Each structure stands twice: as C-alpha cells, then as structure tokens.
Amino acid sequence: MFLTRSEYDRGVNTFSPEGRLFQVEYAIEAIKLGSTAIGIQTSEGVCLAVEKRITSPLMEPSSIEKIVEIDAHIGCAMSGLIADAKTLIDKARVETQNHWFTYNETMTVESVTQAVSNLALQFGEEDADPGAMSRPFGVALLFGGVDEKGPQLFHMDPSGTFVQCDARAIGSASEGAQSSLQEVYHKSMTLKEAIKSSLIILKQVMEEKLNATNIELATVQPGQNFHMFTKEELEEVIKDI
Amino acid sequence: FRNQYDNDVTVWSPQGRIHQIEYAMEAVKQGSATVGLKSKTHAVLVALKRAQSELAAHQKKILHVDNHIGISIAGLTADARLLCNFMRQECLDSRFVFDRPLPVSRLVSLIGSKTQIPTQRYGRRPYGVGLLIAGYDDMGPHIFQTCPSANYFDCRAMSIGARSQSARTYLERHMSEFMECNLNELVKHGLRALRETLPAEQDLTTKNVSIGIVGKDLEFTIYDDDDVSPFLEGLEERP
Amino acid sequence: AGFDRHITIFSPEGRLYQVEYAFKAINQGGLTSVAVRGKDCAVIVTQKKVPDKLLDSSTVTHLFKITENIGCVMTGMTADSRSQVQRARYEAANWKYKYGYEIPVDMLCKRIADISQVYTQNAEMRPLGCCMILIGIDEEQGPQVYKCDPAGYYCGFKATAAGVKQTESTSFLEKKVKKKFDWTFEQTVETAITCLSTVLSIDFKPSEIEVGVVTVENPKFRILTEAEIDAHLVALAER
Amino acid sequence: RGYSFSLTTFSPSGKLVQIEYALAAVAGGAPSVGIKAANGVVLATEKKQKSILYDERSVHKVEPITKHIGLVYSGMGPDYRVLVHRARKLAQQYYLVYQEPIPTAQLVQRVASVMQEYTQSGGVRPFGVSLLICGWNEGRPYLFQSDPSGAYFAWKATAMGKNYVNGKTFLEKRYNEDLELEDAIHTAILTLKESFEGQMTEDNIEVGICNEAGFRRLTPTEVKDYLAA
Amino acid sequence: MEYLIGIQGPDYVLVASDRVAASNIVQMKDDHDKMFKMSEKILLLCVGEAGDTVQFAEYIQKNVQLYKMRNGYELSPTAAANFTRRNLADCLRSRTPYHVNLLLAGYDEHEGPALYYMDYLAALAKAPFAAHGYGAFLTLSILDRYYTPTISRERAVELLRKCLEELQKRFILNLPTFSVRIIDKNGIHDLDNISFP
Amino acid sequence: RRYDSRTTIFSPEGRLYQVEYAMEAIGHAGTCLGILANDGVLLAAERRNIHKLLDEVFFSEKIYKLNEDMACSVAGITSDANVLTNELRLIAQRYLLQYQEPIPCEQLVTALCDIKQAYTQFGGKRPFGVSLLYIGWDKHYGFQLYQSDPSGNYGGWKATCIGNNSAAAVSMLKQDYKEGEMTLKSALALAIKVLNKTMDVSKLSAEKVEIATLTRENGKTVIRVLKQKEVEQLIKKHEEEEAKAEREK
Amino acid sequence: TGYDLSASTFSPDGRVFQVEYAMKAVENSSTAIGIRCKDGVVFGVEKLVLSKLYEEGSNKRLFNVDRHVGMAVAGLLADARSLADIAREEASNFRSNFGYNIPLKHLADRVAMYVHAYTLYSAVRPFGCSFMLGSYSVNDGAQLYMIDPSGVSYGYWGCAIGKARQAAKTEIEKLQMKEMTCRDIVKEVAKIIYIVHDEVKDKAFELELSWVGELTNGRHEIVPKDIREEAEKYAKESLK
Amino acid sequence: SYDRAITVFSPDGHLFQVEYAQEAVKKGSTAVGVRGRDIVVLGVEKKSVAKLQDERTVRKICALDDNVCMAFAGLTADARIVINRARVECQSHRLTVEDPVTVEYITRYIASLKQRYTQSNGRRPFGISALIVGFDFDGTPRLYQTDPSGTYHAWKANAIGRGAKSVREFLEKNYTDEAIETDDLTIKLVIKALLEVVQSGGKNIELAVMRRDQSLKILNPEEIEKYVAEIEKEK
C-alpha cells in the first residue's frame, strides 16, 4: 500500500495538506548532501571542524573553504551549497562591518545569526525586490564566536531558524554524529578535549582515513581571535589522537 | 478527486472554501502549544518550548513587540519573525508620531490587513503562523489570537498549537476564577493548562516553560528558564 | 482541446472561442433589450424583472445616462454593465474636456469597443460579459443607434435587439423596416414595445418594462415614467 | 501538443503554429481583392450584412490612413481598427518629423513592425487580421499585403479571405499590367463575383481606388454604375 | 595654469607637459605625470579642474583598453579622439561637466602621426602643433615662428626647449621641469625631462 | 518527458531544444549563398517567392545593406529578419557616431549575435528563428564573409550556404572552391552552378535569384545588385559551358 | 473541466463559475438581516458563539464605515474587514474632495466597482464577502444597499444575507416595514433572527444589532443594551 | 517532476537543472590547464577546420586583461558573453582601485555572475565551465576553474569538457614537480595530455602560454608542430 501522489511538494508558497511546506523541508534535506561539519561550545572557547571531501589530488586543498571568518570575534562553518553559503557569508560580513560603522562595537553571535537568518527568510518573497532567490538557501551554517556572554555556538538552517547549541553537527552524518556528540559532551570539557572528541567523531563518520589535508579546523577563544589550525598544528593533534 | 481547487489561494472551491488558507491554518497545529489568559489587572502568555536535541537550546516562543504588547507564536518561525518586525515598526511609528502606546486592538487590525493581502492575491503564501497577542492599554488587559487566516478574535483566554484543545477545556472550566486572580494564581492556572497539552510522560520544567506577563504597572517581560522557577514551584503534580 | 480557456490563444480554425462564450454570457441573464430608430426619435426598451418584492424597484435599472444627450441600455452581467457605463461616462466627459464639444454617439461606441478589444487581446483580464446599445441625436446625422459587443464590433443600426430573444426580435424588426413607411415617435415606441411583447409573449404591464427615449425636439435622454409607459401600452391594446 | 498553445514556442520542425492559426483566422475573413493598375490601384471587399437593420454608413471596411494611402482587410474587425488607428498615428508622426507624406512602403514597414511587436510577447495574441495597403507615391502605384506574422509582400494583384486561392487564380488569368483602373475595378468586382454566394449590390460591397488625386471610397451610386455592367 | 604642448612631424608627434600639481600657492607635487597612455601608440594629455582630469583620463584609458581586449586591435588615434570628444560633449550638457582641456597624440600605421586638440566645451580639431594653458599664449608664437611641416625630431626637441625656456623667462607661474616623450611607429618613447634648474 | 519548452531549461544531456527547433526553421528557408574572392565578395540567394503576381519594388527581398561597407542576406522568419536588420543598422550607425569610423564587420556580427544569445537565455521571448550571412570589407581584415545562427554563434567562412539544400551547396562548394584563386567572375559562375544544383527548378529563371556583389573601387566600397540582364548572361554562359562539357563526352 | 479554475475564464455556456463559488461562501456564514423603515435602517446579525473563551463584543460583523453609514457583513471576515477599510477610505476621500458626507448610493457603487475589479483578473480571486450598507440622511432618506461578491449593487427595503437568507426573506416579507418605526423594527429583527436560528446545528448565538436614523441624528450606532435586552426578551417570548 | 525549474529543490535536495548545465559542459571541446613554476599553460582542442572556414574567428582561449586569460568548454555564445562581462569588470576594477585584477578576484566575479543566473527562474545557467589563468602581484602562478553552478576552486592542473575524466586521470598520473621544472616540459605535458584525447596532434590543438610578466602568446602552429615532434620522438 503506497500513496506517492505528493503533488504539493513542487513550488514554494504552497501549503500542502497538514500545512507542511515541503520545499523548505527538502532544502533541509539538502544539507545532508554536504560534508559533515561539527561544532562544540566550551567555556575556554568554541571549536569548528569539517571534512573537506577533496575530489582529486590536483585540486588545491586551500581553495576549499568550509570554515571562514565573518570577523575576528565570529567565525562560521558551513555545509551545503557552497555558492549560497558564499552569499550568506557576504551578508554576515557586511552586517558586522555596518554594526561597527554605526555603533562602534562588535556584534553578538546571536545578532549576526539573526542578520543572516533574515536574508534566508526572504525566499518567501514577501518583499517586492527582484534580487532575492526564490528557492530557500540550501545551506546550514554554524556560527561560533566569543561575545559579551562568552563562547557561543549558533546553528542556522535553510528555514532561517536559529538556536544556540552546546554542540551540533551538520551535514551527511549529522545523524549519528549527534548521538556521539550527546554521549561525549559535558559542559566542563576544555577546548583541547572538545577538539579531540570532534576529530574522533569526524574520523568515525568520514569515509577516507583522516589526514591533515582532508579536514579543516578552527577555534575562537576569548583572548584570541578566530584562528585556523595550520598544517603543522593539525598534524600535531591528528597525531595525538 | 478534487486535487484541483487546492493548488493556489486564488481558486475558490465549488462549496465556497479556499483550501490553501485551511491548509495554512493546519500549520499552527504543528507547533508547540501556547496558552494565554488574563485577569482584571494583568495579561499572561505561557508557552511550551521544543528543542531539536538535548544539546540544543529551546526555541524562543514568546517575543516582545513593545513595553505594552508582546506576542507568542505557534506555527512558522519565519512568518512569526516577519510579522513581529512589522508590529514592532508599527508600534515605533505610533510612539514617534503620536507619543502614545499603540492600542492593541488597532495593532491586531493592522496585522489582519497585512495577513489578508496574501490570501486574496496570487503569489505570496498565507502567513502560516498563529499568534497570541497580549498587552495592557488604557482600556485594560487584552488577549487576541490571529489565525493564518487574517481573522482575529478577542479572548478571555486562548490556547494555540498542538494538543491545545485540552488546555482550552481546562481554561473554560476554570475561567470564572481567572478574572479576580492574582498574577501568581493566573500564571499557575495557565501553566496547568499547558501541562494538559504535554504528553503524560513529559512534565513542566524550568527549561521548556516561558512566561510572559504585562500589566498596568508591569511592562511586557518574558520570564526565562531560571525566572520561571518561582511560578512553577507552586504547581503540585500531574492528575 | 485547451484552445478555449484562454482568450489569447487561437483555435486551429482561428476563432477565439472565449469571446464567443462571453456572447453567451449575455443570454444567460434571461433579459432582452430592443432599440429602434425613427425619423425624429430613438428609443430603447428592455425587460425589468424584480426577483424579490423587497428589492427597491427604483434602484434596479439597465438604462443609464452616459451624458445629458446620450443614453444606453446594458444587457449581460450587471456588474460588468455598471463598469462599462462608468467607463463610458468618463470617456464622454474627457472628450468634452479635451475637444470642447459633446462626444458623438459613434465615437463613444468606438472608444468603448476598442477598449473591449484591448480586453480581448491581453491575457489576464476577461472580456466584459455585457452588451451596450447607445442612443443619441447628432445634429448632422439625426438620430443614431449603435451597439458595442464583447468582441469590439461597434456597428450602427436602424434597429436592434440584444439578449435571449435577439434572433426572434431582429426577425420581427426586419419585417417592419422592410414594410417601411416611416416612424414617428409614437409609432417608434409602439414598434419597440410590440417587438418585445411579441417575442417574449409577455403582454406587458407598465412595471415590467422600462423605456428611454431621445427626440430631436428634446435631445436629452429621458426615462419615461410608469404613467407614460402605461399610456403607450393602453394605446397598443386599444388598436 | 504544447507547441499549439504557446506563442513563444517553436514547434518541432520549427513552426510558430499560433501564427499559422492566426492566418487561418484571416482566411475565414470576408473576401478582399486588390489590383494594381498602371494609373491606379483598386481595393475591394464584400461588406455583406447580416440584416437590413444594419446601417451601412456607420462603419467602413476600407479606411484612409492618409490622403494618398488607404487599406482594406480580411480577418478580425477589432484588430483592423486597432492597427488602422496606429497606422494613422504613424503617418502623422512621419509628417511631423519630415514634413512630407509618408511613403506607402515605409508605412507598411512600420505597421508590420507593430504586428511583429505583438507576436513576441506571450501575454498578447497576434492580430487576427491581414491588410491590403495601397498607395500612390512618386507618380507610381503601390499595393502591399501585411500578414499577422509581421511580414509584408508587394503584389501586383492579390486576394485575401474566403476562396483567396481561387480568386488569385482568377486574377492571374485576368491580370494584365497594361490595365487602366477603369478596367481594373471591373476585374476586381469580377474576382469578388466568383466568391459571394449571393447577389451583389451596391451595399453588399465596398470598394476604393487610389490615383494621382489620392485615395477615395467611391460612393454607392458610383459602385452601382460600375455594377450595372 | 598647467602647460601642454604638442608638435606633429613627418613620422612622429612630440608631446610635453609641466610636472607641477599645486594647491593654492604651495606646489604640492614636483613630479606629477599628466600623460596617460590609452594604448601602445596613443597618449592623452589632460589639464583642467582637479579631479575631473584624472577621472576622465582614467575612464577613457580603460574604455580604450577594453576595446583592445575585446577586438584584438588598437583603436585609431582619430577614433579615440572622436570617442573621448563624444564622452566630454555628452557630459557638458549634464550636471557633471568635466572641466578638462586635452591634447591627444597618436601614430597610425595607415594614417601616420596625428595630434588632436579639444577644449572643455568638447570641440575637436586636428592640428600640426597645439598647446593648452596660459603658457600656450606665450609659446604658440614660437611654434608658429620656427615650425616647418618637415621638421626633424632633433629640431623638434630643440624647438620645444625654446618654447619652454620662454615660459621660464616670462610666465608668472613656476614650471621648473617638463616631461617629454615621442610617439612613432615603434611606439611611445620616453625622452629625458627638459629641466630648467 | 518534455524538456523542449520555454527555451530556458537544459534538457538531460544538456541541450537547449528550442534553439535547435529554431535552427530547424532556417532549413525550410530559401537558399542563400555567399562566396569570398580575392577582389570581392558576393551574396546570391534564391527568391523563394515565385508567385506570378508579385512586384520587385524593393532593392532586394533577401539582400539588405547594413552600412556603406557591408551587407547581409537573411534566411528564416521574415519578421525577425526585419527586426534584426533594423537593429544591425542602428548598431552600425551608433558606432559611427561614437568613433567616427565605419563599424568593423566582426564587431557588428558579434553585437547582433549577442542580442540573439540574449533572446535564448531569458525566459519570455523566443529565440530569433533567423540565420543570415554578412559580407563586408574592413580595413583591418579586408573582405570578410560571416554566418550566424539562431544560437547566437557565428563563424567566418570563405564560402557557405544557408537554407534549403545547404548541405548539397556546401558539398559542391568544397570541391569547386579554389582557395586563393577565386575572382568575382569565377565566384559568380560557381554561385550559378551551386544554385542550379540546389534549386529544384531545372533552369534558373533569372527572376528566381538575386545576386549582389561587394567590391572596393576608388577607395570606397560599392554594393551592387546584378541586374536581370547580367544574371541572364551569367546563366546563359553557365548553360553553354555545362553543355560543352556535356558535348565532349 | 478547467473552466471553473479561474475567474478570467468563461464557461462554454457563458458562466463565470468562480464568482458563483464565491457566492456560495457567504451561505456558510451565519445569517444577517437589515430592514429599512420610515425613520431609518436597522441592522441585525446572528453572531454564533463558537466558544465560551471568546470575549463578548468580539468578532463584530457590524462595522461603522463612516459616521452616517454602517456596514453588516456575511462571508469571509478577513475579506469583509478589508472591504470595510476600502469603504472607509472611499468615504474619507469623498469628504476630503467633495466636502460632504458620501451618498450611500455612490458609496455602494464605488465599493461595488472595487469588488467587480477582482472578478475580471486572473491573478486575484473574487471577494468572499457579501455585505449590506445602510444610512439615513435628512436629504436622501433611509437607504439600504447590499453588495454581492460579484459587484452587483441594489437597494432593498429589506434584505438578508448568509445561511438562512430565504427563510429570513419570507419572514421579512410579511412585515410592512415602510409604515413602521425603528424602535419596533429592532424587536421584529430580533424575532426574525431568533426564528431563523437553528438550535440543533448552531449551539448558541448572541444577537448583535445596530441602526441608523433620525433617532440617532443620522449616526450609525450600536443599540443601547436596555433596548437590546427588551428586543431579545420579546423575541424569546414570541418564539414559544 | 523536479527537473523542470531551477528554483525547485528535489526530494533529497538536488537542484537538477544546474546538473544538466554541468552535463552540457561535458559536450564541449576539451581544455586543459597546468601550473608551471614560472608558466601557466592553457591548451584547448580544435574541433575541425571544415576547409571553408576561417580559423581566426573561432578562438577558445581569450585574454580578459594583460595578466589574466581564460579558456572555456561549453556553450560558445554564453562563453562570449561571460568573457566580455569579465573584461569590462577587469577594466572597471582597475578604474575603481587603481590596481590590476587578481585571478581569484576575476574568477570570483565570473562565478558570482553564473550564480546570479542560477538562483532565479526565468534565466538559464551559463552552460560553460572555464579555466582562468594568471599571475598575481607576488608572481605566483594561479589556476582556477568555474562551473555553471557557481563554485570556483583552485587547481594545480585540471581539464574541462569532453574527455576531461580520462585526461585528468592521465594528468594525475603524469603531473609532478619534475614536469613543472621546465617551461617546455609544461607545454609538452599539456600537449601529451590533449594528445591522450584528440583525433590528431598538431592540427587539432590550440595552445597558449602566459609568462611571468608578458602578455598571452598563442603558440604558432609551427611551434606546436615542433613540440609534438619532440614529444613523438621521445616515445
């Protein structure tokens, strides 16, 4: 007994029976195609990690940029469509600098996440502007930064909803990686332990054996700014594991 | 079949029903429950928050529009955020222009117009979110609900969201005492009402409850996880 | 097929079936109107049917005054008729403003008809499902009778009918013009009333019909009173 | 299939079939005949009326765009009037710019450009009418046809409407370039006489001529005199 | 206030300009370059109201180089002159007139050397020799005196030196150093700066 | 099922079928031909309209002059052809206004091809169902022949044919055309030969073809249409030569 | 049959079925009636109480579209509130430009044309509301007008809209409103509404009444509660 | 079902029209790029002369500016539009910031344009992928690739178009620091790679080089003949 009519999934701005709005749900399914990314929030800081998924050896590893810097205080890790990710990263950067210009201060991670979320919401097309993509943004972002409230990790999804999360995983193996996060995570863990645990989980989920090339790792601590672990630092930690 | 007449808001059905609007009204049922009730001196909003996972924080279900108005949402958070921005700008405009707090009834009228425009035109979908609006003005405490259909109501009490009929029947049988209640009694009544909606295994906690109070002397304040513990402690247990 | 259901697309025989359906929309009303010209007068008659007693008989009318010296009778959808009447009044006043003299009946008909053409060529809007018949006196040409239809055809006529009994009525009128001797005002009105009454079988009373006239002596369009209509009706029965 | 309904869709085998359907709409229109004589050009068409009640003087199928240009149509009456107004306006714009009467070739180019302008957009339908545009410029006669497609051609003589193929064969049999317009009007009424299915009279036909004087619609008495033969 | 001079010849065009950019009275820059190479064999010299000079020169330069990249061959000097004239003339009616006075010098393989002159009102004129600025009033008579259509390039640099030392003798403003360069079939060639200490 | 509609959907295997369907349309058109020679370049076309009661009032039905220094012949929908030729003339005169030099041939072709590409890409408008040959002389590259298609893609050809029997025309031209050895007379003879081969009519009527030649005389381009007597002489010469070749065997 | 999908379309037999489908919308609504008498116009609405939770004096179906005119609606309440905003805008614009209170016939015509705009175009649906308008002015007199979703407008001596239109219309027909006065007409309106109300299908209703007339000095206003209670008691007594 | 509009996501969140455009790229002629230590070489196959066609009109390799060039595989008209737009952006960037464009800047702009056409329905994606080569201010060689989707990636060496899979497998095998040591070795590597997938060697490859501070040079057919002869002899 199979009923597969759907007939309402096509076209945003259509509420299907039971009012589910399936285009956005399919966009939320889309990030599972992306590489797994992982974030852990700790008192010492917030760390972000992602698997690069290098297709060929000739491709330059540095060019793959799945962790980026919105500003010194906030960094982002993304999984999903690289292009619309670039769009949202641009929105985040310009909004941070606009806040600096207007108020001579640094945005909070929640405010930056809300700023990008407002842009993500515009798929509904309530605004009359032509230059807004009709489709929802097929990307999920992890916003990690140290603010007045300390280390904070925010998750953003294609819907534009956002929440703080002590630890979250996005991408293909988010299911199962989140269970591993739930068992390992305790609020007291230091950033060293968080880095090690996140790399353990990434090693588990990743098809290829983990190496300094195929992962990208970053941390923002209260004293420091956003920092990316270099080849040597990545070598040290992946050796320590 | 009748798969036709369901595609768009602009198509009437052979029995005078716009099915897309009803499908939007189904959206409020999806969200976590919310309850609102008022006394002669106060208006209260209480909510059941949901979390994607244990590690994730609970979502924000109560939002402050102004000192004298605040809302709680059931249905799409996107539409909720958009409508909240519109309401906030309307209240700011009223304060700038007339230097008076906007009447809550007039604000819900504006919400109704803005929400109605999508339903009639091709293009933008109906706002698939249901809001409970609670505020104090010179006339007194007020509670309104707005449907994804632009129709709005004025209520002694109301509950929206999943499994809200249980809260509605509790509220109806206990409604008479609400009017003369203290704010503590009133928030306790609302907490029990939303407790009706919860699964039997689940129980009210500091985490999953948010409370929103406004009154003659009290501006709209959302009492968060730590701050709900004074109000929650009074409640006895599940029946 | 699918060649219907949009006005723009042509049939494989190039017929534009949608406008032809708009022509049927006129007959759906169940009312008939007749217009006949005379040597010194032009008249319009149409059925007046009040479905309910409660309806104010004064308000219901298909005879409208586009300007002081032009009158029309609309047959079809009441709302589309009223809209076209408003557009005609605007066109007449705008003509007077721009060109300094009263619009000719033929030019008014031409303007309304070419508007109907822009309707039948652009996609989104539909042809107005109504038919207009204009009567006025032109100093050069004497009395005039003209008809617009949903297609944009605007031809002038000696006499015409519109509605459900159009074919019967034009068959009747065709015989009468063929035995042409003249038409004075009384004979003009009598011909109109006899045509309508014969084709419908009604054997009218004064309430059931509304008549409007123009005459070279009194150029202004006037809608005759029930007493005048009964005066004409009794004269018909007596002879 | 889908090619049938859309106007901006080339069908397989590369046919814009809605335009062909508009040409079919033209073919259903009443007969019209055009013959270019040496000293003039005659435009003729049947003005057959449904009933005696119709007043022939009210509307004309043959219209002057300018003093020296006039045209006739076969197809949709409303579309004819849209473009006749636009043609008159284009000619007056030419006169404002250049202070010379517009050439017939230029006018047919402009109205054909308009007709092409309509075909491209999906929101609009093509004009379901074709025209025979006749003119006298530079001491020479002209006859042109402009189709719904937005294309135009120059004909010595041609026919549109019902039985246009048979009328064209009758014309090419009867046509001589040396004809004067006095004979050409006779040939034109004969070409229409092929296809009436009725007893033609002064009212049932409308005919006009162009020459060094300019375009004119010869009166019912004139066409009666020519019909008497 | 700024001096431009151009001398056409049989197979060359010589161009020179003062190297001073100035505030009210202070001569902020002693080595300002008023010569912009639109292409390999064409130069644009520009003087006028500040800002407008560099903006217009850069705009025309980038448009000409875009022409080069798109079409694979350089614009003719005459075509570049007509193009910049069109751009200047269109702006004259507009609310943002570029108050600029230009001298365009070029070499075409087919049409040989060319020198073009245009004022802020955007008139265009080909000329054998021309100058812009207040110094032009002093120095044009030198050229009109000693110029020959068959002048050799050594004679041309000598004539230019005479023209400039006249400015040194008589012109009120201080234009101590001038830049010099020649266009020929080979292309733009820098020459030693004519510097009067 | 159907990935051939709206001209904006890449079908699986990544093909735009609307433009291909438009390219199908030009094949129905009357054959047009262009040959490049050392001294000149010519355009020859078959006047597909051979109705008895048609007047040759115009300069040419197929051949259009776009500028002093170039011309074009068109195969495809006549209305889109008229639009494209008007746009071409405006583009050329805009370049002349801006730079005060004649438009380069390749630049004009490239501009119109950009228009034609644009109509493909955006949703509402159909692709131009036209293919047209350009002939011109420019100072940079001398005499040039260019072809364009509905896709907006152009190329430079020594000789080419568009329209009905274009494959047969190209096959005949491949063997016959002598690179670097043609003169305008020989190219005219070749044009008559390939037209006679392609055109279904046994005898080229000399009212069923229109030939135009572009040559530089006295430093100024001249675009001339060979008159009926000239093309009559050409077909007579070709018939005589072909019969003599027949007579020998 | 794809003819009924859009309002731009016509049926092959000359019927625009979307408009009729919208006319079926109002029949879902609870009844509302308006009666015109010599002194003025009285309006009444049967406002069903869906829940005890809902406040009284909420979900008002009687609106004041200007000081001298009132509006009673049946059909979609959202569309009705929007139409009321449109009518208020039209009345305000009329006052601003022409300097006096809008005539009711003209106001009905303008809002009717605004409604009729929507039946034509494909992008936008017909309104789902049918509403009555009523005013009293010493010059014009008592006037009652009803506008359907189509944009048809007419003047009614008595009118009914909604679910129980036909029964309400016969009850109104046996009334002789022309001679009567408003303070009796309120009682008879209450009687008719109580009659047509179906106790089995509809659990309960709160009678919502308004009038305009000379007794108000030509201002539409909600009934004083004493008069409401008197009329309701009379209606319950007559019901038996 | 879900393949008719660019905007609509599929179940499992696949946008399929952009995939179809990426497939359209595969139809096109091959192109190859390799980064030498001091050279960047860009090689493109030539379909056929046809014997009545002028080769100059058809050129896959093009110079956006003095320091940047691209080659494309995909729809030729779309490539022409994108090339012109990138050229005007190059000159506009020089106008705005008084500095020459960086290779990553121009590939970002081209990618943003392609992305802009993907996001909105009523516009089709540019059916091209490009190989952009240039030397930055530091003088490091840069090679980037773009696709209809709008993602861009640096590559040490890459190919696009038909036979890209085969030639890139060959290049993954062959490429090393040793091969990049010599400019002639870089040119020979790309020539051998194109020889891996092409009907004939000299006739059907059009190749170009950019040096550290020199303009683009399209190698003469005689030079390409000499290089293939050297490659052929060594075997």
Author numbering:
A (entry chain R): 1 to 241
B (entry chain S): 2 to 240
C (entry chain U): 7 to 245
D (entry chain O): 3 to 231
E (entry chain X): 1 to 197
F (entry chain P): 3 to 251
G (entry chain T): 5 to 244
H (entry chain Q): 2 to 236
Sentences copied from the publication:
The proteasome plays an essential role in protein degradation and is critical to maintaining cellular protein homeostasis. The mammalian proteasome core particle, 20S, is a large, barrel-shaped protein complex composed of four stacked heptameric rings, including two inner β-rings flanked by two outer α-rings that are each formed by seven different α or β subunits. In each α-ring, the N termini of the α subunits form a gate preventing unregulated protein entry and degradation. There are three types of known endogenous proteasomal activators that bind the 20S to open the α-ring gates.
